[PDB]
Amino acid sequence: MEGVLYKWTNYLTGWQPRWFVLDNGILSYYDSQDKGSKGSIKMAVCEIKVHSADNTRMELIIPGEQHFYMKAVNAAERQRWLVALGSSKASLTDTRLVPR
């Protein structure tokens, strides 16, 4: 699978588009669909977090190593990425009650 996902940089530069490519359990990310990758992550050790409130955002977390925040172009895209990235994983759902 391949396509654009936005990567959260920081509060100032915010969402920046990158080209992502999933192959053999490795999610690689490039500046543009155009020589070799400029980065990658091992899906095998990665957890994926998604909030019920939002339909495009997702968070990749490598326990003990790091956490990032991604955003698909649209809701349909995100689902597509989720199936590809996480169909083999188990899910754990938590609900939190907070002051209004």
From Swiss-Prot:
Subcellular locations according to the entry: Golgi apparatus, trans-Golgi network membrane
Tissue note: Widely expressed.
Regions that span the bilayer: none
Domain (PH) ranges: 1-90
S-S bridge residues: none
Region Interaction with SACM1L, residue ranges: 1-96
Subunit structure: Interacts with GTP-bound ARF1. Interacts with SACM1L and VAPA and/or VAPB to form a ternary complex.
Record's function text: Plays a role in regulation of vesicular cargo transport from the trans-Golgi network (TGN) to the plasma membrane. Regulates Golgi phosphatidylinositol 4-phosphate (PtdIns(4)P) levels and activates the PtdIns(4)P phosphatase activity of SACM1L when it binds PtdIns(4)P in 'trans' configuration. Binds preferentially to PtdIns(4)P. Negatively regulates APOB secretion from hepatocytes.
Domain notes: The PH domain binds the small GTPase ARF1 and phosphatidylinositol-4-phosphate (PtdIns4P) with high selectivity, and is required for its recruitment to the trans-Golgi network (TGN).
Protein name, per record: Pleckstrin homology domain-containing family A member 3
Organism: Homo sapiens (Human)
Highest classification ranks of the organism: Eukaryota, Metazoa, Chordata, Craniata, Vertebrata
Name of the gene: PLEKHA3
Shown residues in whole-protein numbering: 1 to 99 of 300
